[PDB]
Design a protein around this ligand. Sequence first.
Ligand SMILES: Nc1ccn([C@H]2C[C@H](O)[C@@H](COP(=O)(O)O)O2)c(=O)n1
Ligand SMILES: Nc1ccn([C@H]2C[C@H](O)[C@@H](COP(=O)(O)O)O2)c(=O)n1
Lengths: 316, 316
Amino acid sequence: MLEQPYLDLAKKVLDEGHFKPDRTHTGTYSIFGHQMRFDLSKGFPLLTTKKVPFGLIKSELLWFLHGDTNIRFLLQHRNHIWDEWAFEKWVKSDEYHGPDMTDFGHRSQKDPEFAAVYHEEMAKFDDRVLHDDAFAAKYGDLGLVYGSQWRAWHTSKGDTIDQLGDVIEQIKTHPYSRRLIVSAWNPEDVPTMALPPCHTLYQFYVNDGKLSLQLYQRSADIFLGVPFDIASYALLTHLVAHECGLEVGEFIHTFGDAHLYVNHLDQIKEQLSRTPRPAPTLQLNPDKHDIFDFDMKDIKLLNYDPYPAIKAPVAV
Amino acid sequence: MLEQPYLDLAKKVLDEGHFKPDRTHTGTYSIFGHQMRFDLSKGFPLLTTKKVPFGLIKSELLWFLHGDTNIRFLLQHRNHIWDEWAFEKWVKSDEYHGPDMTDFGHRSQKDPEFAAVYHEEMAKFDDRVLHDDAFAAKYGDLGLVYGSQWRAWHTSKGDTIDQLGDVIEQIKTHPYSRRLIVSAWNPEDVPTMALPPCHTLYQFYVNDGKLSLQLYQRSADIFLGVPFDIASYALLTHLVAHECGLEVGEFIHTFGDAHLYVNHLDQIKEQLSRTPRPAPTLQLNPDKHDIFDFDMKDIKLLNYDPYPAIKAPVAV
Ligand SMILES: Nc1ccn([C@H]2C[C@H](O)[C@@H](COP(=O)(O)O)O2)c(=O)n1
Ligand SMILES: Nc1ccn([C@H]2C[C@H](O)[C@@H](COP(=O)(O)O)O2)c(=O)n1
């Protein structure tokens, strides 16, 4: 099946995976150096062995393609992947005058009392970001997130570069270019950033009329993160291909530190006992070509028949 | 043998390698996406199937580690790898009042007359860079070459970042960090640069007391370039390991566009008919630890018994 490489990655890390401490305090099983190849002409790489929320992937990816860095758009689309980060900022400023939301995340999973209190407080924050237009501007804007890295790279001369836009133009004018790279890693910023981008950079390639893309992900959570990452970049490959009027080639996923958190081993083995089903199809609005103008209704995933969802705790 | 992965890369590109036009006008055979793994505890990855000049690799690498961007240092060490680039600049300014050094490189290989004239003119330029202290400052300084990318990244606030230095400090204080990345790709600069760096970025990794490194090379000339690239980064891995007092792990070489220029096929097959010999050893000065203070005499390659050199034309 199309997802076999991902299951193979799950196996070897379990086998060859050498223990390694980490940032949080849940140990990990890690490997270093690995590459996966997904032939996009054979189906869409959304896992069938475990239900993955494709709705969350589209909305997030669009948020990126719009050069947007504000969480209002995501909330506006029921997406809550980036809430925690904007929330951390809110809670730490002189304006917050609520409960003990200090070092929250870990504590939420710790005890019932807080899990509710935190959820009450979070909801309130989201509400303001959704309606208090000025609040959204202060505590809702993440600042240096992918959207601004891909489409508004700040230069040392006060300007902003639209890396992705220019790369798309290069594809159309010089398809056989080996310089079609887009970078998310900026040495000036990583030092103080909350979370240096995991998807460090990606490169485009054209031949035989097909576009392929290789991603370099410095760090990867094999159970919870990788199933999403494959989908966001495989999707992106389709989009750029559509805009440039090309056929899709492959998505090549390269890793630095690929790891399986220790508290996910049962679920991972749980997942390794099922048989992958045929891959879903992806059809895009043929009327629209400029991907920067895409909306949710423009991307349609066809007949995705996955196994039930598998729950697991976030390593904090 | 240790170099088998490189020969395997030579084979498949010859086999799977699909034709693809390129920047110059010598066609190429290309593949996209590929990774090699060199266990540095088994020997040093300098090719035995064809004599590779290790002297040129050390001098160039030191030039990088010194944050230096001036060609005087290289010439001072009989290294001429970066001459052409500084030369191009000289020839194109109001000060040059010599012959028809216009669009030179290609023409040199074209006809005898020019090949000599160009060599006479080049030598003169080098001489000044070596002795005319002020000339060396104008036409000898390459500007944005690896040395300044790795050790003097310019920020949007007038400062400079020593990426490599800081990464070395992170290794020593937080060995299990998945953020030990060093980037050579700066979106602000690539637009006008003569040659965007091929060695886009590299990542460090620590486990079991051993340091490993993965490189992401957007473009690679399989015959003339790759044998050098492996050596420079394998060497670098040893150095950082030595300074941080760690054992060497592996060097993982990842490629974007790996290609074999059409006018190198005979030589490549010529090279594929020999049997690799045992790998040379690398011993470093045990008295010195700060690699930024290393000199040529500090790096010693032991018993490297290679096959004769194979000549081939530069694709221009
Ligand atoms: N979609 C995502 C988002 C994040 N991560 C993971 C990588 C690491 O598990 C953690 C970041 O930790 P660190 O910055 O120290 O690498 O988040 C991932 O694999 N996929
Ligand atoms: N040591 C080096 C130096 C350069 N290159 C090669 C990669 C390409 O063959 C060419 C650069 O072309 P472009 O910038 O269009 O990729 O130089 C390489 O492989 N190894």
